[PDB]
Design a protein around this ligand. Structure first.
Ligand code: CD4
Ligand code: CD4
Ligand code: BCL
Ligand code: BCL
Ligand code: BPH
Ligand code: V7N
Ligand code: V7N
Ligand code: V7N
Ligand code: V7N
Ligand code: CRT
Ligand code: HEC
Ligand code: FE
Lengths: 335, 60, 38, 179, 271, 69, 124, 52, 56, 56, 56, 38, 57
């Protein structure tokens, strides 16, 4: 019937598990011996091999588990220590940032202190993981492309710290919670006037879609020439075979231009990195340079005209004026 | 000034960086199968094809 | 690691651990003089 | 004229028509690249693709059919031979080639695993191998190897190109419009 | 102009429609029957987009908007002033997107390749067809489609998302976002991995396939295959588009209330 | 001691130092967020003037605009 | 309830937080659910702060708020010392009304039925 | 002692230290979040003045 | 009845048994902690007469 | 006793203990979620004082 | 005491120590800067009696 | 690195450590005169 | 002392410093252009006494 689409593997080989290339083991070592998963070998490689642990990995795990524990314990306390409510309401629970009136000063423990402590530990854990990735790359004499690709995502993550500090309040930070951080995303877009009109936001959208397009194209291309040996990309890069030639020719005939077996990975790398880089710049400019992105877009000719849906008389213009939101009432009045 | 603001300056700096990056990647794209063959003779688009790149292999 | 090497490490580790705890006890004494918590 | 193909007409951009039998002369989808005439090596200077009989530490995972001794049904729905030995990749453990002994034996040919399909997508009874790319007769014209235990990158391209070129040249119908 | 290895691949055969009439190359492009059909629909659709810009108030690229008809026309072909031009452009886009996919299938057939690229592209076409064909038909009006404008179609997305008061709570949207985010992370990992081996620490030899598998086992305890990463990338990218099509087709045709209220089923489990 | 034969001292020291670092940072941060022991702001107060019994889950207002920065 | 800046550049004129925006979002979710409508019934969500781009109903909605503040403060709340204890809340306050009290999840109360026109004693 | 032949002492003691550390952290956190045993603020109060 | 230890590995049974018992103990302890009647961190000094009871 | 030749006792025991344990927790949790059988709070009530659901 | 350098590489220890000290110094300096009493860039010219003090 | 090499490094390390702590002690005493935290 | 060029490649170094200098010059010019006192395209004809000054506290 249909040809072999190279989507799954029917016949799997088994040998002794790959212990690994010899590396320096003075400040760390490999744990486990390497097992085989039958289900994982159907899709990719079957070996659940040994994992390397060193200084940076251990420290990162300790700090990250501390942050995870703080977040989870605050979530559990928010439902009164009810395990049934803890599981039932888990998507809605959060570890909330401090109140706005404290600015950058230290909040009370139950009103944002735990949040800042967990954020600090998570940041330390992420930086230690970056160090671990760098050391793992340079222990095998590899280039450091993955460390800088990770640094781009770390930059986007750290804008969620730097923008609240630049506007001057920890209350503007992202809460730790499944549904609450989406609530923060929506409210952040609303507060600053329709983040759709942030140009760096649109740029990051373009790079996210471009990443999806590029990975779909590359995966389909490599799977289409996998019967010719195209999945061995290093060989086709150092010694170009007919699979690389056919990929190049397909895309040149389809598009009028093409890449090589090596430079398509440069395209992929740069699209993925530019996603988070442009996103971080866009977040950094919000609330510090521009306070209303729709009005900035109107200024620079980005907003399409529509017919007016309403008109207001002068007394209506004075009446429909409102008030900026203020403090919550701390008293229950009696009338 | 008044019309010029920080977001616009950052956007144009990003545009210049992106165009430079695209030129670099297009140069890297022409490391195989070049120069092009045509009846009129050899052909290269912009950017021009870069210098020959040589790899390093482990000894036997 | 030989048994003698473990013996030599243990002596330094025990002295360093106990000394560290004593220094922390003095710090808790100074804090208690300043603002007691019980 | 070293590629054994002639342009259709005198208008530039026109397609080439092969002069002989494009499967063997290596034209179009049957073309192969001039790779190095040396075997690929693993991380420890050993042949990357070897038959299982050269390395008895490799075996077949449980619950996977042993394809050795199984019929090879070609595009004609006629058995073209029987699998007798597997060639595996030692760098990344995976079946790369099947060795097929023909019906009247007297020769052995290689078959890349990428052109092998299993019945019912490998869900129900796996009692044969499906090769949709080539006919039972053209199994005899698959290029051979210099040695019986290692395969160089040059011949690796030739076997793969020969099979991949048969999706357009196995029969006259495969190179024609559907409507 | 041809690549130094290109001549021997430029052979006849592999087309789905036509013979030697449409089996030529215009410059680098291959022109088939579906290449001719693509150019017809691209030219007609683009010229009608330019006409829609000339009918509107501005030539500003960001502000040009060709809008769909009013909901009162209800699956009919509205007047060209009132949204009928949008419907004609939609037909040209569908014809051009379909012709592009079939032209890609012809090219892969000529090169002795698999059919993965046309079907991977079909995931994007399916998402577009859901947005302008399937969902508007289920809702009963072509006016439920999005306008054709660089920033005008962002206004449509915003207002449609807020038709359910919080679009983040859409369960299919949550899955589709995860597919998009994981795909970008996996692409960065794959691009870095190949480049780090091919361009290693200066003065050292180019790495091998063992180096990749050892590296990702050292970092994460598991290394997907060289073919596994390309299978996963195809699954993540295409599945992102398929789950996007599901997420928008269930909003309105199946769910009309706010998306936060949908999670009643989870809160009312008997346990 | 034979415990160092079972556990490599190199491996234990890193875990031990990391645990102490996290624990010391946690305690110093907890005291900084309390009213009684926020020593950077109120360290100069005597023991009698220091806050007492200020659990107060809603000790401060939660909803307000940002300070006039 | 306003949180959106009327300028391109930030100033001290508006220092609303994201949390206050979440509060307004929750209030408007309640308002939408009390009438069975979505955001776009009263807003062009490309700019929530604009009245020209919004349907006229928004103006109507604003008046509703004012009317509620006059019904809750001056009529329902002062009735506190008249009810029995079973009618009050846990803080011992009189019942108060919201949009859903009249609308009950419809764009108009009772789908816009007109009854008071036939009862002159009820309209002032 | 024969239990140490059935179970590896290294893995048992690592899991024991890890379990007790998490348990101690969880209990100290619960008391800190409570009203009666928020000892950082309430510690100097006598038992009669402690919250109930 | 000792023959079950040849059917099932004693080492795997003990680990699974201890894991299930630890999780069960935590769930029961925390179910009581969140209840009004058995908080015992705030209201542990109350007598049984003063302890809360659910509404009839 | 011949069922154990057709069905492997090792996996039957695991599936039986797994199913019964999950079923017991589901029933206990369903009762704890109800008003009449919220025994942690109202377990000291008599059968007369226990809540009863809405009637016709 | 000097034998710690045989167990631990001085190159790795020194790099880690410098990274730890740099982060610690930045954290303490930033915490003081964000406070009211020790925001020295703005209020560093105030005398000790004029500097802010937390509420009693 | 030999045992003699470890001895030579240790001498420079304690001197660098001591010099760092002493200079920090001067910085803390200077800050105390300016604005005492206790 | 010129042996420093035997430790760092002159070609690579001078390209880096030309790029870094250009970026720094553009950053300083653009920061001044965004300010109130030194927006010289608009207010460059004002005398030093008429130029804006930041608020005095
Ligand atoms: C905020 C945090 C964010 C998030 C965080 C962002 C952090 C910064 C990221 C920057 C981009 C990194 C891209 C990448 O692939 O990185 C992996 C690589 C790994 O290298 P390695 O492991 O050390 O060794 C591998 C190496 O051997 C091969 O690397 P590969 O080839 O893959 O890529 C490295 C180079 C290409 O290398 C060459 O071209 C060398 C070939 C031989 C010499 C060439 C001929 C002689 C030239 C002499 C004159 C030239 C001399 C330079 O690729 C790159 O570095 C990326 C190039 C593309 C990007 C730039 C495109 C133009 C942009 C400007 C346009 C202006 C307008 C027109 O790591 C590196 O550091 C690479 C070297 C980077 C050099 C530029 C550094 C710029 C720093 C700028 C800030 C400095 C402080 C003010
Ligand atoms: C980001 C950085 C990079 C950005 C840029 C990225 C670029 C990516 C692509 C890279 C390659 C680009 C270069 C390229 O494609 O070159 C092709 C050609 C050389 O071709 P060739 O190699 O000599 O041709 C080979 C072969 O086709 C020989 O066949 P033959 O010589 O018999 O040609 C027969 C063709 C041509 O006859 C025609 O009548 C076609 C005329 C097409 C252009 C004019 C269109 C308007 C009038 C339409 C006709 C009117 C009646 C005659 O006959 C055919 O039928 C060939 C196929 C045509 C398409 C299929 C049929 C469609 C039928 C339905 C639609 C009809 C039109 C609506 O060379 C040139 O045209 C030289 C100039 C190249 C640069 C582009 C210049 C563009 C100027 C205008 C820019 C406007 C910007 C908005
Ligand atoms: C109503 C909601 C708003 C809106 C508000 C925002 C906001 C606010 C933001 C975005 C951002 C993004 N939005 Mg938007 N967005 C909207 C509409 C859209 C639409 C659409 C369908 O219309 C799309 C496609 C997008 C898409 C995108 C992305 C391109 C971008 C995030 C990039 C990324 O990879 O992030 C994911 C990547 C990261 C977060 C990187 C960091 C990851 C770290 C390192 C992970 C550590 C994990 C740790 C180890 C494990 C967990 C530990 C536990 C926590 C303890 N938005 C509308 C207009 N959007 C971001 C952006 O850059 O904007 C400019 C952003 O902040
Ligand atoms: C409110 C701010 C002031 C002002 C204050 C200053 C001050 C103060 C200075 C400048 C400097 C410069 N300004 Mg300004 N400037 C103003 C408005 C302008 C306008 C304009 C459109 O109005 C322009 C085009 C410029 C342009 C320039 C450049 C000529 C120069 C920076 C060169 C550079 O890139 O170095 C960075 C470049 C590199 C690192 C690489 C390239 C190096 C080459 C050699 C530079 C050649 C430039 C020049 C000929 C230098 C002499 C080189 C030797 C002959 C070898 N200014 C306004 C009115 N400007 C700086 C300068 O150097 O002036 C000479 C400087 O000190
Ligand atoms: C190019 C931009 C994209 C990107 C890139 C990227 N991310 C990266 C990398 C790169 C190139 C890495 O090298 C790095 C990595 O190692 O990936 C495998 C990383 C990484 N990206 C990650 C996540 C991530 N990336 C995201 C996004 C993106 N990453 C961008 C789209 C997101 C999103 C969309 O929000 C997430 C969540 C991590 C997998 C990893 C960084 C790991 C890290 O820093 O870990 C720190 C360690 C901890 C926080 C400890 C956690 C402890 C546990 C939570 C407790 C365990 C308790 C118990 C034992 C188990 C409990 C189970 C439950 C927790 C389920
Ligand atoms: C809300 O409130 C919350 C916060 C939750 C409440 C908190 C509650 C909790 C749970 C607290 C936990 C506390 C705890 C846990 O157990 C505390 C445990 C603390 C411990 C164990 C500290 C131990 C420290 C040990 C040290 C410093 C040792 C140093 C050793 C040295 C210097 C010698 C090494 C040098 C050598 C050997 C060189 C010779 C080498 C030679 C010869 C060679 O190499 O040959
Ligand atoms: C609304 O509420 C909702 C919830 C929806 C309503 C619910 C509805 C439903 C669907 C209810 C279903 C109920 C049900 C289904 O049938 C219930 C079925 C229950 C059953 C079957 C229970 C059986 C239990 C038996 C056990 C535990 C036996 C254990 C045996 C042991 C320990 C001895 C083994 C040891 C040996 C052998 C050693 C010798 C070894 C030897 C010799 C050797 O080694 O050889
Ligand atoms: C709104 O929708 C709603 C409200 C839901 C309405 C919709 C309702 C619907 C659609 C209902 C459908 C109902 C239905 C359909 O027909 C229901 C059909 C039910 C049926 C058929 C049940 C059959 C049960 C059979 C049993 C229990 C057999 C037990 C056998 C035993 C014990 C012997 C085992 C012997 C063994 C193992 C080996 C021995 C041999 C040995 C050892 C040897 O050989 O040696
Ligand atoms: C705000 O509230 C929060 C923040 C929460 C409160 C919390 C606070 C906390 C927890 C603080 C923790 C502090 C801490 C932890 O213990 C602090 C620990 C500090 C320490 C130990 C510092 C040590 C510094 C040592 C230095 C600088 C040494 C330099 C040595 C040099 C330069 C030697 C150079 C010579 C050489 C190399 C010889 C050449 C080689 C030769 C000859 C060869 O090879 O032969
Ligand atoms: C029994 O169960 C227990 C409790 C034991 C364990 C279970 C735990 C569970 C179930 C945990 C669940 C966790 C969940 C669901 C977490 C969800 C997390 C999400 C969705 C997070 C999303 C976004 C968060 C972001 C982007 C946060 C960013 C925070 C930052 C950047 C904070 C930075 C803070 C810094 C640098 C603080 C520095 C401190 C100083 C004092 C220096 O400055 C203030
Ligand atoms: C008609 C009943 C409306 C519905 C439906 C929605 N909103 Fe609205 N919005 C309405 C009024 C009368 C007001 C002003 C109220 C006041 O006291 O001033 C608003 C205001 C907002 C704002 C603030 C605008 C600003 O300038 O800051 C926002 C951000 C807003 N509304 C959002 C919003 C959302 C998210 C809604 C659906 C959940 C929504 N609105 C519906 C009238 C009506
Ligand atoms: Fe790839």
């Amino acid at each position: 019937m249909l040809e072999y689409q190279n989507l799954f593997t029917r016949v799997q080989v088994r040998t002794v598990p790959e212990a690994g290339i010899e590396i320096d083991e003075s400040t760390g070592t490999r744990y486990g011996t390497g097992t085989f998963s039958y289900l994982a070998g159907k899709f990719g490689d079957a070996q659940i091999g040994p994992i390397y642990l060193g200084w940076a990995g251990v420290l990162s795990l300790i700090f990250g588990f501390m942050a995870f524990e703080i977040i989870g314990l605050n979530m559990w306390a928010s439902v009164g220590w009810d395990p049934v409510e803890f599981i039932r309401q888990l998507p809605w629970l959060a570890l909330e940032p401090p109140p706005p009136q404290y600015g950058l000063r230290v909040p009370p423990l139950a009103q944002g202190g735990w949040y800042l402590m967990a954020g600090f530990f998570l940041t330390i854990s992420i930086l230690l993981w970056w160090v671990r990735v760098y050391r793992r790359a340079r222990a095998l004499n590899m280039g450091t492309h993955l460390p800088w690709a990770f640094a781009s995502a770390i930059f986007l993550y750290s804008t969620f710290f730097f923008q609240p500090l630049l506007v001057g309040s920890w209350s503007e930070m992202v809460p730790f919670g499944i549904f609450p951080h989406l609530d923060w995303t929506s409210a952040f877009s609303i507060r600053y006037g329709n983040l759709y009109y942030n140009p760096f936001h649109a740029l990051s959208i373009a790079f996210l879609y471009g990443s999806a397009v590029l990975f779909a194209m590359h995966g389909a291309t490599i799977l289409a020439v996998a019967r010719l040996g195209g999945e061995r990309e290093i060989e086709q890069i150092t010694d170009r075979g007919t699979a690389a030639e056919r990929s190049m020719l397909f895309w040149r005939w389809t598009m009028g231009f093409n890449a090589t077996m090596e430079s398509i990975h440069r395209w992929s790398w740069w699209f993925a990195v530019l996603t988070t880089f442009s996103g971080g710049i866009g977040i950094l400019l919000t609330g510090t340079v521009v306070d209303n992105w729709y009005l900035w877009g109107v200024k620079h000719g980005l907003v399409a005209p529509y017919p007016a849906q309403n008109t207001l008389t002068e007394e209506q213009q004075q009446l429909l004026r409102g008030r900026y939101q203020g403090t919550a009432p701390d008293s229950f009045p009696s009338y | 000034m008044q019309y010029i603001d920080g977001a616009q300056i950052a956007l144009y700096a990003f545009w210049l960086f992106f165009f430079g990056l695209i030129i670099y990647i297009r140069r890297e794209d022409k490391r195989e199968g070049y120069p092009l063959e045509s009846p009129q003779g050899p052909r290269e688009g912009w950017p021009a094809m870069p210098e020959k790149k040589t790899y390093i292999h482990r000894p036997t | 690691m030989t048994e003698d090497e473990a013996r030599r490490f243990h002596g330094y580790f025990v002295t360093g651990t106990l000394g560290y705890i004593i220094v922390a006890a003095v710090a808790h004494f100074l804090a208690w003089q300043w603002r007691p918590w019980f | 004229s070293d590629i054994k193909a002639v342009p259709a007409d005198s208008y530039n951009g026109s397609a080439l028509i092969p002069t002989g039998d494009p499967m063997i002369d290596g034209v179009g989808p049957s073309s192969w690249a001039n790779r190095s005439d040396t075997p690929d090596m693993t991380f420890h200077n050993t042949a990357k693709i070897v038959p299982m009989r050269l390395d008895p530490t490799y075996s077949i995972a449980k619950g996977d059919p042993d394809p050795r001794g199984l019929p090879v049904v070609a595009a004609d729905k006629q058995v073209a031979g029987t699998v007798i030995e597997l060639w595996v990749n030692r760098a990344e453990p995976q079946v790369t080639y099947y060795e097929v002994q023909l019906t009247g034996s007297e020769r052995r040919v290689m078959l890349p695993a990428g052109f092998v399909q299993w019945p019912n997508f490998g869900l129900w009874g796996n009692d044969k191998l499906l090769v949709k790319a080539i006919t039972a007769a053209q199994f005899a014209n698959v290029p051979a190897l210099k040695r019986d235990d290692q395969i160089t990158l040059l011949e690796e391209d030739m076997v793969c190109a020969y099979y991949a070129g048969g999706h357009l040249y196995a029969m006259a119908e495969r190179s024609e419009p559907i409507i | 102009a041809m690549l130094s290895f290109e001549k021997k691949y430029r052979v006849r055969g592999g087309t789905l429609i036509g013979g030697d009439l449409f089996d030529f190359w215009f410059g680098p492009f291959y022109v088939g029957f579906f290449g001719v059909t693509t150019i017809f629909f691209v030219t007609l659709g683009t010229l009608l987009c330019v006409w829609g810009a000339a009918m509107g108030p501005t030539w500003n690229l960001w502000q040009i908007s060709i809008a769909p008809p009013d909901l009162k026309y209800g699956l009919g072909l509205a007047p060209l002033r009132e949204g009928g031009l949008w419907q004609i452009i939609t037909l040209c886009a569908l014809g051009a997107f379909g012709s592009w996919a079939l032209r890609q299938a012809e090219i892969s057939r000529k090169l002795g390749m698999g059919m993965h690229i046309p079907w991977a592209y079909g995931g994007a076409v399916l998402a577009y067809a859901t947005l302008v064909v399937i969902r508007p038909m289920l809702l009963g009006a072509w006016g439920h489609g999005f306008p054709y404008g660089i920033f005008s179609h962002l206004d449509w997305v915003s207002n449609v998302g807020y038709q359910y008061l919080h679009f983040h709570y859409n369960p299919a949207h949550m899955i589709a976002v995860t597919f998009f985010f994981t795909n970008c992370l996996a692409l960065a990992m794959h691009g870095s991995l190949i480049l780090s081996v091919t361009n290693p620490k200066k003065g050292t030899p180019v790495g091998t396939s063992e180096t990749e598998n050892v590296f990702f086992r050292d970092l994460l305890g598991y290394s997907i295959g060289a073919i596994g990463i390309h299978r996963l990338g195809l699954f993540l990218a295409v599945g992102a588009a398929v789950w996007s099509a599901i997420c928008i087709v269930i909003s309105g045709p199946f769910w009309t209330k706010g998306w936060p209220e949908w999670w009643n089923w989870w809160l009312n489990l008997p346990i | 001691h034979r415990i160092w034969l079972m556990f490599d001292p190199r491996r234990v020291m890193v875990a031990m130092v990391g645990f102490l670092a996290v624990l010391a940072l946690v305690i110093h941060f907890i005291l900084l967020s309390s009213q009684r022991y926020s020593w950077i702001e109120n360290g100069t107060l005597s023991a009698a003037q220091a806050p007492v019994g200020a659990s107060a889950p809603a000790a401060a207002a939660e909803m307000s605009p940002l300070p006039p920065g | 309830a306003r949180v959106v800046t009327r300028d391109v550049a930030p100033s001290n004129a508006n220092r609303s937080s994201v949390k206050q925006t979440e509060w307004t979002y929750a209030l408007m979710i309640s308002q939408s659910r009390s009438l069975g409508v979505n955001c776009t019934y009263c807003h062009n969500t490309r700019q929530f702060a604009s009245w020209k781009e919004a349907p006229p109903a928004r103006v109507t909605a604003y008046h509703g708020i004012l009317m509620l503040r006059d019904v809750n403060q001056n009529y329902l709340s002062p009735l506190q010392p008249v009810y029995p204890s079973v009618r009050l809340g846990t803080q011992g306050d009189a019942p108060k009304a919201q949009c859903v009290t009249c609308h009950n999840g419809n764009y108009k109360p009772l789908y816009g039925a007109q009854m008071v026109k036939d009862y002159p004693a009820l309209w002032g």
